[PDB]
């Protein structure tokens, strides 16, 4: 029942749901299908508000950071916002919670979320709000119970632009590795993680559970995906993250600042290319520069672009933009391919939410990767396969999609979407509304 | 931040978001505020499964009904479904929960639901599921706590497409009149009820709270909306329902059979017309016949159709198809107007979907009036933003969407219009 | 030999001048610290005059440490006439001052080597002093020199008589008293009324206008027919913070209004014959004036020439979502586009009396909506480049032969 | 901030404004010498031509008093129709900047005191904006006047009143300006001067710098008569100094002796590295050198000619004989698209654009496939002919030999819908 990733005209027909006539005389009586995506996150609740730069330093914060805070310092901040009646919005959050939420909206298929949740949920609470607000098709039944509160992210915006985060973890890192459902990760087409998962008070089991999901991920050949949580967290130990990506990660989500922190390259293109030594596919959100994508394709199946060749540190880096991504392991003679797209319709008027924008362009990519798993099980004999790809569409096309989604997330306050993209009406549908 | 009702090319520009530059020169120093819709329901959870028509009779059920059952009968049925591993789908339900859910998906604005909810919610439970599944923009913060379980609706399919429903109410009818948020209903553009709300064990407060919600609705001149839950519920006392509609209800949703039970008219058009004696606007879903709509417009502002004139018991009833609906009270020379549309693309809970579309159009008028009071769309105090012909176009398309899927709840709105610039972008 | 205004496909066939007054200026650009501004008694966002010796002190600090980045011709009306000639490929006459003896490498030298070719400077007036120096600090610091010494005898009556518009800036009355520039300006306006030449006015900062808003209003009624403006300059003139309303209130005094609303886009308001109304095919927009673009598609007339005048409005948003990163010279560019369209009407009427585009005494060649389209595009061009002066017109679409020729 | 040469769809992306966010994350002009001249155009009788010792189709110097008599009769009878800046190289530097929207430096003379309304004033108000005249030299005399005398037939006779136009001194040649250039442009008229005037000496000092810093030298011709006086000296000039030769069909027959344009250009290729000849209505030919390893063969039919199938490798980029390791001779010709004097002066500007474009794209895009070797032109000979042919067509549909309207660029898919909105 999954939607098509993007709005481009496709050469091959996409079924959308298995009840399709041609597909019904086609599929077997016993049909599995049902392709999904799973991620791990620190169950969080955003509490957004604008504040003075005085409010920032008064609580030991720095602009543009994501800093954890002590429990007593947080209650002091919580009380000052209710006193001054400064709170503007309360909604679900989490770099990966947002991503799973946006995935379900874009594809209208299920996503499983792994994390924590109050064992007893009272109405009107932060844990309650998290549920009423989470997307419908996002599945929260596999969460784990905790006797404490879920996490609170005090998103402080201040003057136009930089959005500061202050985290009251609560029990958000109390996820145990026994709570990782083996069967869910096996039938997944990607496992999505964020750099914030290692940031925890020592001894908390979240990292223990995260590595356990990766165990299952490797068992069943499920790509591991990683998004990053600010430049400062990474620059502390760049070589540790580098070593981590080689062993486990297969897909890397990133922005230009987070990337230079990892590679030492002020050029996103080079940072992304240097990253390809460690992972199979890289997405780099460069803010106003646009976004880049770098990955691998089979050298025999390369498709050369029809756009002008772009200049860059790597000459003509989009030369095979129209190739689809494969995992390095699945290639016989892997070839590096790169692509870049500029902001949609010249970008927004207002800078707005640049933090959750990257977390959204990622969801677009996940959609395309799931779509490949979905269309492969429903139409296996298709020209779209018998080569073992990673993405259903080409890098150029996936950029086209993810770029359009980021524009959606930037042009609104929240980082979570509630409405998918508008698809084209055919002639019949068009005349219907015009009649 | 509300979406536009339908996908038609509009003469007047719809702001969509109160942040629109053209609207901030227009907008005062303080927020202009969006509108919303509220409804009351028996918090329910659908539990779908196929069974024999033999299985139906084994629990005192009839094909095609919606029947309550006692707790011992319910625990036996639940155990038999888990035993044979027969359950196929579990999701949120309720005639009005669905409608409020679909409204939020279609409009992308907030909807308030009033009802019950376990005060202690354990993970994996039914009360848990209700939350994880309800749409985001549907607001459940105003539900009421209960020491019991929410309702379970066992949807049983009879192989021919027949849907039998077996209801284990639990505490779903325990909504108290104090729990009705007065301020929520005041800023609403409609209060939505379902005929199922009167079905409860004696002494339970649900009816008391219902009368209390309607009380607030009249305070602030909020239209009351009523959808019906089967012909059988109405045939019990059709003249009682008639009396209810005159006093309270302003908008009536129905299907052809539900209507015949209420008015005695096997012709939907005639039944709807008779219904207009009691309410201000009528939506009647006639299945494969299509769906009809009947309402009032000011005889001064009538806009005559440009489509061919249709034959029916009411001669040339679509003559003013293109008029907008008003409430009878707001009209000085009220005029009856009718419209009819056939199924989308020849045909393949649907009625509860076409209603949601109507709610959207009514909220859109409330939204566009607060953001652009100067526009030609408000020389008078209308009920719908669009014309009956246009509202039917929308509701018909939505019911088709609910038919082509299994569940009665939508998960994604309709495909929106792609302009020329977007097209070139994707085709690049 | 004039170009077509815009790149839109035209129903009527185009076969293929304007005069203005300015304080002859030369831009000298440099970026500086916010400390540098207060160190010389300046304020941000102004155009503040400075003395000749104080000007020499600022000039010298820029030469020592070499902070000057770019030097080019300037002046709100110098830019506008310059950009007009680039866009239309027709002549524009500029009136002002100029060193009577010009040495190679000088500032007066540069102004000539840099001014557009098709722009005609022969009617300038000689002065034994220097032209003006504008020190652009990223605020403007002005060393007037002799820029305001234009004498009214130097106003060529015959030039303005055969013109289709006279273009002025509010900066022409801002001068040390006793300098003759304002007198020369009034003489041009006197000539303009004789031969029925529309008067055009762009404004030079909110501060200049807010001092005595009620006076400028009266100026526009008597003389002005076309008003160029930005959103701030507009609130100062009318007291209406809404650009739509401000532009509307200004229509009480003038015949046509162009208001650059920065990121909001740009508005336009004018008059058209109620018989010749052409109603828009775009959605009706909301605003303080309901459905104000209802007749976006009418052509512009002067209030006097209408028998049943009707007010008509249009609004368009920034091109391609605005730029990536010079919000000043843009308005001075958007204006040039309007001039281009107005010249085209007098041009297309004099070369093609048989065409249907002259059924009435029009002001604009195109529709109000179509003109906004054109001016909007030019503003984007002025924003993407550094200087406020254009160097190449817009690219026009070629036929199939050009397509096939270049690809072959 | 330079424009792209031509309107063809390019395989490689052209940065245009060096701001372009692309090249910035990993982060060029042409100079010429001319006799400062002013065109004064007018229609005249065939009696008017002979009356001052002139012949139709020449560019003839005249005495100062012979000029004063001619000037006075044109004002008396009110015969002058247009007055504008001129000079075979003045046109070129002007037209280049119009087409490329980048700077061009011009070297010459100019009144040290310029009064309003004068000819020196007019020259500046009229010169292209982006043309830089700051490096000119001051002179205590009047600038040159070229009286363009046209007849009803169309013959454009030229009468030159040199004044001090040939007083350019070799010290006034800016050493560094020519160094960072991509071409040094000269005209056959620079050696033609009254004896003792230093103008030819200044030319040789500019050429010194050109070879010093490896700047290709360019040469355009005036009329066939200018060369037929001494064809063998011009030839000898080309070998040592010139790297690029500009020519038209008649000017060429006088230098090479070939009534066939193709052979003449080929003969000239022995002395210089690249030759362009304007063949009037026959079209235009181009000949040069390319690396034999990277030659790219045409997709057009092979043409018959004095050299059979001369367009066999039309699509190659041109190199200098010196820069080639194994040079190959390459030829191309294009016919007219869809003022016979100034049109050729325009096509030269077009080629300069492409040659600078290579210099511009090389400094901004060192990594591209377009700079493996050390090329001369950015585009292919077939593509370069397209451009210059297109420019010459514009020069004919207008009066003056200087342009005011560069080429109109192709409207995009996105833009076109905007203008259609
Ligand atoms: N315009 C455009 N096209 C893209 C882009 N990315 C990939 N393509 C094209 O899609 C074609 C492959 O179609 P599929 O990807 O197999 O089918 P799909 O329509 O379901 O995606 C490729 O062409 P091909 O098969 O090599 O050539 P052909 O056989 O389609 O002629 C490739 O050139 C893009 O960003 N823009
Ligand atoms: N095609 C079509 N049109 C419909 C339908 N229902 C109403 N209309 C037309 O819409 C017009 C009114 O526009 P509004 O309702 O005020 O604007 P809106 O479309 O943006 O809401 C009416 O025309 P009017 O105002 O009388 O004529 P005009 O002023 O629109 O020219 C009416 O004829 C329908 O089902 N199909
Ligand atoms: N594309 C476009 N068109 C606009 C715009 N504004 C006005 N028009 C249309 O231009 C037409 C008038 O054309 P002119 O303005 O005379 O011709 P032009 O193209 O040379 O300017 C009008 O209708 P018409 O029916 O085309 O004229 P007619 O054929 O009835 O005379 C009007 O609808 C705009 O922004 N974009
Ligand atoms: N249509 C056309 N093409 C010309 C002409 N002259 C040269 N070319 C083509 O230009 C290509 C080289 O492109 P570049 O010069 O590097 O790129 P450019 O488009 O930016 O100039 C050559 O093709 P290639 O790369 O070998 O061909 P392909 O593999 O791109 O098909 C050659 O065929 C001409 O007159 N007409
Ligand atoms: N998982 C996680 N998400 C975070 C953290 N800090 C901020 N975010 C989320 O990041 C998003 C903004 O980029 C919001 O959804 C925040 O709630 C953190 O420490 N962990
Ligand atoms: N992604 C990626 N994997 C590599 C690269 N070089 C070696 N490997 C992997 O390292 C292991 C050693 O062969 C195998 O799993 C390879 O696929 C590289 O450049 N990129
Ligand atoms: N409120 C309410 N909804 C019901 C009842 N019986 C069935 N439904 C719902 O009606 C929908 C099908 O029309 C499903 O969501 C059912 O759960 C009932 O008694 N009350
Ligand atoms: N709905 C409805 N109310 C009516 C009608 N005729 C009179 N009324 C009542 O008359 C009053 C005037 O609006 C209200 O009480 C209405 O309900 C009718 O045809 N329909
Ligand atoms: N006429 C005039 N132009 C000015 C003044 N101040 C700045 N400018 C010019 O206005 C342009 C920027 O809008 C630049 O060319 C400035 O040099 C002034 O007082 N008068
Ligand atoms: N611009 C303009 N002139 C007006 C308006 N109303 C009257 N006038 C003129 O003002 C003078 C006094 O009525 C006459 O010249 C009128 O034509 C108006 O709304 N706008
Ligand atoms: N430098 C120079 N230009 C000339 C001469 N004769 C004609 N021209 C110019 O050549 C152009 C016509 O080809 C016009 O601009 C003429 O002024 C001459 O002797 N020297
Ligand atoms: N341009 C050119 N130079 C040649 C040729 N043959 C020899 N040379 C000269 O020989 C030297 C080697 O490059 C240089 O001085 C060249 O100019 C030839 O065919 N063309
Ligand atoms: K890896
Ligand atoms: K939910
Ligand atoms: K009623
Ligand atoms: K100039
Ligand atoms: K006036
Ligand atoms: K040589
Ligand atoms: Mg991030
Ligand atoms: Mg201005
Ligand atoms: Mg020549």
Curated annotation (Swiss-Prot), chain D:
PROSITE patterns: PFKB_KINASES_2. It catalyses: guanosine + ATP = GMP + ADP + H(+); inosine + ATP = IMP + ADP + H(+). Mg(2+) is probably required for activity in addition to its role in forming the Mg-ATP complex. Its cofactor is Mg(2+). Changing residue 380 to A: Mutant is less sensitive to ppGpp inhibition. Guanosine and inosine kinase activities are both inhibited by ppGpp, a nucleotide messenger universally produced in bacteria following nutrient starvation. ppGpp binds to Gsk, and inhibits its activity by blocking conformational dynamics and inducing tetramerization. Inhibiting purine nucleotide synthesis is required during starvation to maintain levels of the metabolite 5'-phosphoribosyl-1'-diphosphate (pRpp), which is required for the synthesis of histidine and tryptophan. Disruption phenotype: Disruption of the gene causes a considerable amount of guanosine accumulation together with a slight increase in the inosine productivity. Optimum temperature is 38 degrees Celsius for guanosine kinase activity and between 26 and 39 degrees Celsius for inosine kinase activity. It is an enzyme of class 2 (transferase). ATP binds at residues 278-283, 344, 389. Pfam families: PfkB (PF00294). GO terms for molecular function: ATP binding; guanosine kinase activity; guanosine tetraphosphate binding; inosine kinase activity. GO terms for biological process: GMP salvage; IMP salvage; purine ribonucleoside salvage. Keywords: ATP-binding, Kinase, Magnesium, Nucleotide-binding, Purine salvage, Transferase. Optimum pH is 8.2 for guanosine kinase activity. Optimum pH is 6.9 for inosine kinase activity. NCBIfam families: PRK15074.1. Catalyzes the phosphorylation of guanosine and inosine to GMP and IMP, respectively. Can also use deoxyguanosine and xanthosine, but not adenosine, uridine, cytidine or deoxythymidine. Shows a strong preference for guanosine. dATP can serve as a phosphate donor as well as ATP. Shows weaker activity with UTP and CTP. Belongs to the carbohydrate kinase PfkB family. Homodimer. This is Guanosine-inosine kinase. It comes from Escherichia coli (strain K12).
């Amino acid at each position: 029942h999954m939607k098509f990733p993007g709005k481009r005209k496709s050469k091959h027909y996409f079924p959308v749901n298995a009840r399709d006539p041609l597909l019904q005389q086609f599929q077997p009586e016993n049909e599995t299908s049902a392709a999904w995506v799973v991620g791990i996150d620190q169950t969080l609740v955003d509490i957004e508000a604008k504040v003075d730069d005085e409010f920032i330093e008064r609580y030991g914060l720095s602009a543009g950071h994501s800093l954890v805070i002590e429990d007593d310092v947080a209650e002091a901040l919580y009380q000052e916002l209710k006193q001054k009646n400064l709170i503007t919005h309360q909604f679900a959050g989490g770099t990966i919670g947002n991503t799973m939420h946006n995935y379900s909206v874009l594809a209208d298929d299920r996503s499983v979320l792994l994390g924590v949740m109050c064992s007893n949920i009272e109405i009107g609470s932060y844990a309650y709000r998290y549920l009423c607000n989470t997307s419908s098709r996002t599945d929260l039944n596999y969460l784990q119970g905790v006797d404490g509160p879920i996490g609170r992210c005090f998103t402080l915006i201040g003057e136009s632009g930089e959005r500061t985060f202050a985290i009251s973890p609560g029990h958000m890192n109390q996820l145990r590795a026994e709570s990782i459902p083996e069967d869910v990760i096996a039938g997944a087409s990607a496992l999505v993680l964020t750099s914030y998962l290692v940031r925890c008070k020592p001894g908390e089991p979240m990292p223990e559970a995260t590595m356990k999901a990766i165990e299952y991920a490797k068992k069943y050949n499920v790509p591991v995906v990683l998004t990053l949580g600010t430049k400062f967290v990474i620059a502390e130990n760049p070589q540790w993250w580098q070593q981590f990506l080689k062993d486990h990660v297969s897909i890397l989500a990133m922005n230009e600042d987070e990337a230079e922190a990892l590679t030492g390259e002020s050029d996103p293109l080079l940072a992304s290319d240097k990253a390809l030594d460690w992972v199979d596919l890289v997405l780099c959100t460069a803010g106003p520069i646009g976004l880049y994508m770098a990955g691998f394709t089979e050298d025999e199946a390369k498709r050369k672009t029809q756009h002008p060749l772009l200049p860059g540190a790597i000459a003509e880096f989009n030369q095979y933009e129209f190739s689809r991504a494969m995992r390095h392991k699945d290639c016989q003679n892997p070839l590096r391919v790169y692509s870049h797209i500029a902001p949609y319709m010249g970008g927004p008027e207002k800078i707005m939410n640049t933090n959750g924008a990257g977390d959204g362009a990622l969801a677009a990519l996940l959609h395309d990767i799931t779509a490949n798993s979905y269309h492969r099980s429903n139409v296996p004999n298709s020209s779209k396969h018998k080569f073992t790809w990673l993405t259903y569409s080409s890098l150029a096309q996936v950029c086209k999609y993810a770029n359009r989604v980021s524009y959606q997330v930037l042009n609104q306050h929240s980082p979570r979407l509630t409405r998918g993209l508008p698809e084209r009406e055919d002639s019949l549908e068009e005349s219907y509304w015009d009649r």
